[PDB]
């Protein structure tokens, strides 16, 4: 049972994980993802949502007051508050599976060079709230993150060392062939095989993890 | 002026991209011939994994021996944002994303004795497949393209004072050097607290 709200300057960016959600866990009422667009709390006829940065410098910086009033209206006291940024706390399987066990995720996407910090602190005073990086590189705004970390959480919402390589039909295909312990019947050995190949493998791409 | 092609079996999920660069994306169920592109895997195993004829009929037709074929995959090499820097540079970028359990892993071996491939992850965690990270790597990438560390400390905007916290005072000061070492010290803070790695310690 849970509840996700993403709050975004461009609402259509989410449409597509919304409608790759399975009816089965939305009939069940086991899932919920709900996308607002942030300038429904915009304060004047321009519909502002961004200001020059205190301090100077390049770019924009998003308006507290904007996404104040978005907060107020979208959280609650059990209300688990997400923000993408590059700034951020690493989002691991870890936290997908902890946050998986929530029952209210929302998702705050800025844009320009961010969210005035006034808002994840305030906040941070009567919810929970979680500054999130999906890895160490740049994106333009928190949109692609948020798809992201709904998926990664999701799929682990029951009902909605590396990996070595895998292998189907054909046995031989343009002179490679499967490797022939994976057919032996040996599985004693075929696990074996694959722990070597998941050791060398991790080797060679992610010598951090060891 | 880069060109990039996403082969995947839902085209549908990377409508979210929305003159110097061409994103083109291509259903790879029109590779296939009888009224399935994935199979049980050798070895035992739970899941599906996706055939390599496919692939290979999709590839060979989308594919040049310029081109970087680039594979999402949670076993992949970290991509990072000097992949994205060095990706920035290049004419032609084909990504395939995977579904099920992943692809065969001789796609990725057969390609690499035609063109440079490059299996990567875009983090540790697990998608549903490779579309999300797609759309990652795409984002990241094409910012950097001509003509389109530490971590960042806070920023603000005004106003100045709101639901009784206050911008700190030396943003307001206008003293660019006052301004400049607050900054500085704001993101060593945050480094340290956030992703001490960055600075050569270890993580929690
Ligand atoms: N891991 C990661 C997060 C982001 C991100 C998140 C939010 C914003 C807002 C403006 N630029 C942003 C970038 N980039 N990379
Ligand atoms: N860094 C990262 C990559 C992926 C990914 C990429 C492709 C497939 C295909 C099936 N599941 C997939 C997962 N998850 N996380």
Known sequence: ????????????????????????????????????????????????????????????????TVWGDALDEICTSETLLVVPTPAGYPFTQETAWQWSTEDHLVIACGRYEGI????????????????????????????????????????????????????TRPPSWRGMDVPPVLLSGDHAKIAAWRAEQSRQRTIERRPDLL
């Open 116 to 167: 005035d910090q006034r808002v994840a602190d305030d906040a941070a005073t009567r919810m929970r709230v979680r500054e999130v990086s999906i890895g160490d590189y740049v994106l333009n705004g928190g949109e692609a993150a948020a798809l992201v970390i709904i998926e990664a959480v999701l799929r682990l919402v029951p009902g909605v060392l590396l990996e070595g390589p895998s292998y």
């Open 1 to 64: 049972s849970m509840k996700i709200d993403v709050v975004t300057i461009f609402p259509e960016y989410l449409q597509p994980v919304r409608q790759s959600l399975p009816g089965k866990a939305i009939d069940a009422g086991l899932v919920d993802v709900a996308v607002h667009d942030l300038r429904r709390w915009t304060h004047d006829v321009h519909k502002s949502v961004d200001d020059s940065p205190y301090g100077g410098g390049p770019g924009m910086v998003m308006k507290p």
